[PDB]
Design a protein around this ligand. Structure first.
Ligand SMILES: Nc1ncnc2c1ncn2[C@@H]1O[C@H](COP(=O)(O)O)[C@@H](O)[C@H]1O
Lengths: 80, 156, 979
């Protein structure tokens, strides 16, 4: 319930960025935070955690993302 | 070569039991070819329809890695809107194996129905959902024959 | 109006059909046949002009043999033009080469279209001739080379229109939004590629109805993903769709006479690092002619200071006459003019080959008008090629002539430096177009002619009659012989000094021939020069040069574009450290339908036969295939079910596949996703990169539908060994029509594996039955290979509303043919030899070397400093990521190898591989560890690969991953196991 926590995010080129966030932050809020730090347009990349595509409407606590977790960045359109 | 050297560093990072992702069981073909990987795809998500499955696949890296995208093929082929009848799946283009494999399990639960390859599975995903779930559940159970002996898989 | 597309195949893809037809109606006159003259004449004759005429009544001197490859010691005394015309006509039987005897009356220039004046024409005569050409509409082009310097002049008359500026394909792309202010927004993650000043037409714009009529709009680039065309409020409002195509508008450019340009020149810079030296050399080359007038046609003496100081005065006197050249407040740069006077008598092959190809391309633009011509002037120098005076000093004694053919080369570098060039041991990989130009320049340099040097050239290919256009060392008499062997004897006739010094081999460079090119071969060489055409071989030679720490001179051309790369050990990076799928399903360009048709051509006539040939010859194939299975079993079932008997059955199979691939599968796709289908978000399914297809109704009178059946039937008949009375050169429509009009075509209706494995007949049923798989050949025009891919691709193009392509355009995309013109090949080869001068001095200053990039279409010349090899570190120990490696002596054991790395290097070896074979891994189970930890490196490879290391192998390259003293992975060099 609103506990501070830092999480890691892996990019496509196996590079890890460290972010300081809270469980009361939406994925869209976090996705916009990775946008300004890496340079990727918002439409090109999404976020996957333990094989779960994070929707922009939910928050970090909605996906049971505790402290020192690792997010993953994947293209939005990648199907054959 | 800069291709075999790059493949080694990514093969050790995905098979070291300290950094290994529990969602994929990676082993080399004949334990000697670095450019041919036998990967076992597992969906650990409990709410997913593909839960409990072990879908065997094969990755073949070309000689011009990473300047050419590698091929990914399900053996055997699975029912998915983004998988050809040949079992193969298009890999797009600086990219790592970890990003590609994670991109694959993400497509398994959220298929890109707008750009379909199996038109049968695509029309079944949206128009006949009950039939698509039945084809996947039957596909997951037939996958249990492709388990080795002694392997345990947690949720973690 | 016919063009030999068998001889000019690679050249037609550069110049086009229309431009080559104008070239075949233009008579070219070249004045002066020194090294620069014969280099221009060779490339122009090879390019195929209507007629070639040369004029040079001067007697052949031994010093002229410095750059002219068509002169021998036996020709000394006779006229340069007469002895060269014979050897020039041999290059192209379609181009007659004549000799103009006396140019006393200038009215003889009226029968020519392009006049070329080389260095043998005085500046006073160049102006007299240009005044007659400019006032008569004749194109005038001049050029001269002074040592390591040179320039060129272009005057194409007072009226010249550039219809095509670049010769490239017009850039096109899809539009996602057109704002009312004109901001044309592209689709997601697509770059328009346009630049300011471009012009574009529009298509498929739903709402701006008057925007699609073909009116052109000026492009104002806002960013890499958008451009602006002005307010489009008059045309309506944007809804969806849109495809823009760049259109090249004509540009009528006006030229000034040579007299006008000497006073107010317009420069085109060959190197922006030396863009100030342009106006300096403009007065220097003029002063060289004033010096010749004041000295009875004499040039400034070699390394002479009295003449060099007089030239500086003439340049200063000219600066007062022409104050616009240098401009106000800029000094004369006496040091530059002094170097120009020192080399005024030099004849450098690298500079001649450079300007020879450059001016020749300007002659081609003069006859065809295909590219953008040179804007009135360009100057170029390669002063960085001069060796260090501390090792090879230059003065009036070292650079004096020695009564040899290299006198004009010694005049620049000195006698001691030319001896080292002759004592160099070089390796030329490939004897193609670049290799032929490479051996010619090395023959003029005398490279390898010394008692300590040699030349090794290897090429496993033979000479063909079609290659005689792009390979000028070969003649019709040599077709069928080996490329490297004939090119060896070709240069020995130009310079007999190389006789017995060229080792011509016919062996392919690769891992297959590591016994022939062993350690003793590579280590004895000084440097290696690449003359290859494919990337697979280039990377191997590059990885070999990195292993043995030898310099590599890399080059390559693509049409009018070309580049050079210098690779220095321990200093710069190598050539390896530099530089769809969905599109087949939803095509929007002709490239995607060809890739779809090319893959269909493989599964029809190549993969189906290999599966049947293996199902019949391997008994366990059914059980072996279980390790794609349904597609393979279906391929063998369809290949043995509809087995054709005569050629009439093959026509039926091709017509049925036409209905399946282009009518039924399209209706089945349109059944699941109609033209009005919508996605989850409510967006139209068929939008943007996706085009709603339409089913094809077969029409035998449609050229693409007809040839899909002819080629499809002829190729299937080749698989099943069926022959026909039809002519393989001309199919008859009425015969194919009576066969199809009597067929019953099934209508369309919308739609485990152990059953399939039981439907296959036994191999014993078909005893001796063999299918002949089709081996794809792009260069044969009678095997129906290109006929199928062209017809099949255009049919799918008709489905998705893509514009069809002809055979020549499809052969280009399918075969991945690299265009090659003779002008860029000679120019690029010259730049390689100018860097070769820097390899002889063993220069280590990275700024002295220069990587070149040329685009003769603009024309653009740019040079960049080579990139230094990236450095890394482990345990605070810096190393070179490209060149550094670990040297281990003896066939060490795996256990002692890890011990040597934890003690001497502090690295815990976690993995170890040998080529493409993984040998050791720290995460192996204790069973795999103890088994391999006690084996040496040679026995470790035998255990893993089941193959023995041959006795001719003396070294082994091992890739390793290791952790530092903190337990984290760190990049480390590779290992060389010295057996
Ligand atoms: N691996 C190789 N070994 C020997 N020669 C080669 C190799 N690859 C290409 N070549 C030669 O390189 C030449 C290609 O140059 P070009 O004719 O200009 O395309 C031909 O003579 C080929 O036979």
């Amino acid at each position: 319930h609103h506990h501070h926590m830092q999480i890691f995010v892996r990019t496509l080129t196996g590079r890890t960025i460290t972010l300081e966030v809270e469980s009361s932050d939406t994925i869209d809020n976090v996705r916009a935070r990775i946008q300004d730090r890496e340079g990727i347009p918002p439409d090109q990349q999404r976020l996957i955690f333990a094989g779960r595509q994070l929707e922009d409407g939910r928050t970090l606590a909605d996906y049971n993302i505790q402290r020192e977790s690792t997010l993953h960045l994947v293209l939005r359109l990648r199907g054959g | 070569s800069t291709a075999s050297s790059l493949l080694l560093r990514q093969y050790r990072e995905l098979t070291d039991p300290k950094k290994a992702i529990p969602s994929f069981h990676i082993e080399l073909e004949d334990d000697s070819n670095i450019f041919t990987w036998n990967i076992g795809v597992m969906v650990l998500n409990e709410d997913s329809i593909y839960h409990g499955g072990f879908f065997k696949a094969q990755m073949r890296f070309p000689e011009d890695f990473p300047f050419s995208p590698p091929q990914f093929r399900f053996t055997p082929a699975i029912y998915h809107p983004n998988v050809y009848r040949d079992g193969r799946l298009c890999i797009s283009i600086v990219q790592t194996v970890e990003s590609v494999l994670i991109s694959i399990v993400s497509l398994l639960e959220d298929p890109n129905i707008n750009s379909p390859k199996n038109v049968d599975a695509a029309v079944d995903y949206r128009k006949n959902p009950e039939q698509y779930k039945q084809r996947v559940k039957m596909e997951v159970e037939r996958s249990k024959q492709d388990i080795p002996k002694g392997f345990i898989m947690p949720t973690s | 109006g016919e063009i030999d597309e068998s001889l000019y195949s690679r050249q037609l893809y550069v110049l086009g059909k229309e431009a080559m037809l104008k070239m075949q109606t233009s008579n070219v006159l070249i004045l002066g046949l020194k090294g620069l003259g014969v280099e221009i004449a060779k490339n122009v004759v090879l390019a195929g002009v209507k007629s070639m005429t040369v004029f040079d009544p001067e007697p052949v001197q031994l010093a002229d043999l410095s750059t002219q490859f068509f002169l021998t010691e036996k020709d000394i005394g006779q006229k340069r033009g007469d002895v060269t015309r014979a050897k020039l006509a041999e290059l192209n039987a379609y181009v007659p080469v004549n000799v103009l005897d006396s140019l006393d009356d200038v009215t003889q220039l009226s029968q020519f279209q392009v006049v070329v004046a080389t260095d043998t024409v005085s500046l006073e005569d160049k102006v007299k001739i240009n005044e007659f050409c400019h006032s008569s509409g004749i194109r005038f082009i001049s050029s001269e080379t002074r040592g390591l310097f040179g320039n060129t002049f272009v005057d194409l008359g007072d009226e010249f229109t550039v219809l095509d500026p670049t010769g490239e394909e017009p850039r096109t792309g899809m539009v996602s939004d057109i704002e009312p202010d004109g901001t044309v927004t592209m689709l997601d993650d697509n770059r328009h590629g346009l630049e300011d000043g471009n012009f574009v037409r529009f298509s498929e714009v739903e709402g701006l109805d008057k925007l699609n009529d073909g009116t052109l709009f000026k492009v104002e680039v806002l960013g890499p993903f958008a451009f602006r065309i002005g307010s489009v409020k008059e045309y309506g409002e944007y809804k969806k769709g849109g495809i823009f195509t760049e259109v090249k508008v004509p540009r009528k450019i006006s030229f000034k006479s040579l007299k006008q340009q000497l006073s107010n020149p317009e420069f085109v810079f060959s190197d922006f690092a030396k863009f100030d030296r342009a106006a300096q050399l403009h007065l220097g080359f003029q002063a060289l002619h004033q010096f010749a007038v004041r000295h009875n046609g004499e040039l400034p003496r070699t390394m002479n200071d009295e003449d060099a100081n007089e030239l500086i005065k003439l340049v200063t006197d000219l600066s007062v006459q022409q104050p616009e050249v240098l401009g106000e407040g800029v000094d004369v740069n006496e040091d530059l003019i002094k170097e120009l006077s020192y080399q005024a008598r030099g004849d450098i092959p690298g500079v001649v080959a450079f300007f020879g190809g450059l001016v020749a391309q300007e002659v081609l633009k003069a006859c065809s008008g295909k590219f953008t011509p040179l804007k009135q002037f360009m100057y170029f120098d390669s002063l960085e090629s001069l060796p260090d005076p501390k090792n090879f000093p230059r003065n009036e004694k070292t650079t004096q002539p020695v009564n040899s053919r290299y006198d004009n080369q010694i005049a620049v570098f000195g006698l001691d430096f030319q001896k080292k060039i002759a004592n160099s041991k070089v390796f030329l990989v490939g004897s193609g177009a670049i290799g032929c130009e490479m051996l010619k320049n090395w023959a003029l340099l005398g490279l390898g002619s010394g008692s300590d040097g040699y030349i090794v050239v290897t090429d496993n290919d033979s000479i063909e009659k079609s290659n005689l256009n792009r390979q000028f060392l070969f003649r019709p008499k040599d077709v069928g012989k080996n490329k490297s062997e004939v090119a060896a004897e070709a240069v020995c006739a130009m310079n007999p000094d190389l006789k017995g010094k060229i080792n011509a081999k016919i062996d392919k460079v690769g891992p297959e021939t590591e016994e022939i090119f062993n350690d003793s071969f590579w280590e004895s060489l000084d440097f290696v020069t690449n003359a290859l055409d494919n990337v697979d071989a280039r990377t191997y030679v590059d990885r070999r040069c990195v292993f043995y720490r030898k310099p590599l001179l890399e080059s390559g051309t693509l049409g009018t574009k070309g580049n050079t790369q210098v690779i220095i050990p321990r200093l710069t990076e190598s050539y390896s450290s530099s530089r769809l799928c969905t599109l087949r399903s939803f095509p929007n360009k002709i490239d995607h339908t060809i890739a779809w048709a090319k893959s269909l051509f493989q599964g029809y006539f190549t993969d189906s036969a290999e599966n049947v040939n293996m199902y019949l010859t391997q008994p366990n194939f059914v059980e072996q295939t279980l390790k794609d299975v349904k597609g393979v079993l279906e391929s063998i079932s369809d290949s043995l079910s509809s087995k054709p008997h005569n050629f009439e059955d093959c026509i039926k199979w091709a017509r049925l596949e036409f209905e399946k691939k282009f009518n039924h599968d399209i209706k089945q796709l349109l059944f699941n996703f109609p033209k009005d289908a919508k996605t989850s978000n409510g967006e139209p399914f068929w939008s943007g990169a996706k085009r709603a297809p339409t089913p094809l109704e077969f029409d035998i009178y449609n050229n693409d539908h007809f040839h899909f059946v002819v080629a499809g039937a002829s190729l299937r008949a080749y698989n099943y060994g069926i022959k026909s009375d039809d002519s393989n050169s001309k199919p008859n429509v009425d015969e194919y029509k009576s066969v199809i009009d009597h067929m019953i075509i099934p209508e369309f209706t919308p739609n485990e594996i152990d059953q399939l494995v039981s439907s296959l007949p036994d191999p014993s049923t078909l005893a001796g039955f063999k299918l002949e798989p089709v081996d794809f050949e792009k260069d044969d025009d009678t095997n129906h290979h290109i006929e199928f891919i062209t017809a099949c691709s255009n049919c799918r193009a008709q489905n998705y509303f893509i514009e069809t392509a002809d055979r020549q355009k499809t052969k280009f995309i399918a075969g991945r043919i690299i265009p090659a013109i003779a002008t860029t090949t000679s120019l690029v080869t010259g730049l390689v030899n100018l860097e070769l001068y820097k390899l002889i001095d063993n220069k280590t200053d990275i700024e002295q070397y220069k990587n070149g990039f040329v685009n003769l279409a603009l024309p653009f010349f740019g040079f960049s400093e080579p990139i230094a090899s990236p450095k890394g570190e482990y345990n605070n120990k810096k190393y070179d990521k490209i060149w550094d490696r670990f040297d281990i002596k003896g066939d060490i054991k795996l256990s002692d190898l890890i011990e040597h790395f934890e003690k001497d290097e502090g690295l815990e070896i976690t993995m170890l591989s040998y080529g493409v074979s993984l040998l050791y891994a720290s995460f192996f189970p204790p069973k795999k560890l103890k088994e391999r930890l006690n084996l040496p490196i040679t026995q470790l490879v035998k255990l893993v690969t089941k193959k023995d290391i041959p006795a001719h192998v003396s070294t082994m390259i091992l890739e390793i991953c290791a952790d530092d003293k903190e337990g984290e992975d760190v990049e480390v060099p590779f290992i060389t196991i010295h057996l």
